[PDB]
Design a protein around this ligand. Structure first.
Ligand SMILES: C[As](C)(=O)[O-]
Ligand SMILES: C[As](C)(=O)[O-]
Ligand SMILES: [Zn+2]
Ligand SMILES: [Zn+2]
Lengths: 234, 237
């Protein structure tokens, strides 16, 4: 009946969850199949990086806020659940998963990244994997996308405050309006966006700003929930 | 000879990780035993609630920063690894793990938390377990703390911005000063089956350190000093 479930009921997910694999350490890889599924259904995902959690919690809350039958798009809350309980960027093998996809530009070697926003120089080192798509997490996500074939992917990260949509599109600016973030128009080797580029899978990286889970779950709750509900207003 | 590992290599964990069990969904329960544990060795805890992320990244950063030799205290980054992955406060059973401890004051049925700091009341319903200490995450931690017998426990949460020391002791006043958070004895509401409630019945000193609302990006900046010093904390002498 209502657009949203009463707050008193939002402690738990609506029943429906499936598993799409297992993490390196044995935690399930989880995804939430859209109830209103169709060929227009996109894939919304988060937590590729274990320390990027404002977007994980906000999407979880949105999932638990929007009445099920209104959700059009498939959701993965956390791509990297090991890195996530270890509060770190990489998975459990030290691999920057977003340098591990079996894209055409997957170079093997080392990657580096910034300590925080106040970090200035990308010095903190990680690896890229042994072979392309080497990690369990990478394959599972890739296999999940090939099976369901989303019309588009929106990949949440942080803390750059913007929407990155190389297509310049209706979604990428719906996203700009509703999250009040600037829009901006993939070469990052072995990243998710390069791998989608190869397939002409539309991929928008949704870069949260540095924000608490406590603020985001209020500030960004509605924009997120509307994202699960989105359709080109035509 | 440095107090901290070089920023360039803080991407991995220093050796000596162990498992003290399995989450409901099958993830490992992971802990980081203190290098040379002594009678002084205490316990530093995080991620009891899976959406209270900013301390689990902060503690993971501190653990990955401070030079390993200098660590005095045991560490659990994530009590509820199914919680953290699901961006949820409860575990995979809709149980509030901090109402699930086999303390004497454990009560069956429902518990309610605050949606967020914006919400005017506590009305979001969770479960307390179908029995005292029902949940695997809860049992595993309870047995860990029996095996190791810590000097004390600091458990980090979100987002009440304060240090809750029921004893008002030194560590409590250290924590208050080091993290620039007020020192208080309680969250002015009742929490049956809470971890601290279980600790009090064992006469184990538990301190809950509540972060304020703060991103993992600024907490990895603003509080890394304090967290790192907590891993090597000793009384005044
Ligand atoms: C710096 As990136 C493309 O790994 O979010
Ligand atoms: C409700 As509490 C003391 O676990 O923040
Ligand atoms: Zn990132
Ligand atoms: Zn709490």
């Amino acid at each position: 009946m209502t657009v949203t479930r009463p707050r008193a009921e939002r402690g738990a997910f609506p029943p429906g969850t499936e598993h799409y694999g297992r993490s390196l350490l044995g935690a399930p890889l989880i995804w939430f199949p859209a109830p209103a599924a169709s060929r227009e259904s996109g894939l919304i995902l988060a937590g590729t990086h274990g320390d990027e959690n404002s977007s994980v919690v906000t999407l979880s809350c949105a999932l638990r806020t929007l009445t099920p039958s209104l959700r059009r798009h498939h959701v993965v809350l956390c791509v990297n659940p090991d890195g996530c309980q270890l509060g770190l960027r990489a998975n459990a093998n030290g691999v920057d998963l977003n340098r591990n996809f079996p894209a055409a530009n997957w170079k093997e070697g080392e990657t580096v990244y910034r300590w925080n926003s106040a970090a200035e120089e990308r010095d903190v080192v990680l690896l890229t994997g042994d072979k392309p798509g080497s990690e369990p997490e990478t394959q599972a996500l890739c296999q999940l996308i090939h099976r369901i074939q989303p019309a588009w992917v929106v990949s949440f990260h942080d803390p750059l405050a913007c929407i990155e949509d190389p297509r310049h599109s209706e979604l990428g600016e719906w996203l700009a309006q509703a999250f009040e973030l600037p829009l901006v128009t993939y070469e990052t080797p072995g990243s998710f966006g390069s791998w989608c580029a190869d397939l002409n899978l539309h991929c928008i990286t949704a870069e949260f700003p540095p924000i608490s889970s406590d603020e985001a779950s209020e500030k960004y709750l509605f924009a997120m929930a509307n994202l699960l509900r989105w359709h080109p207003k035509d």
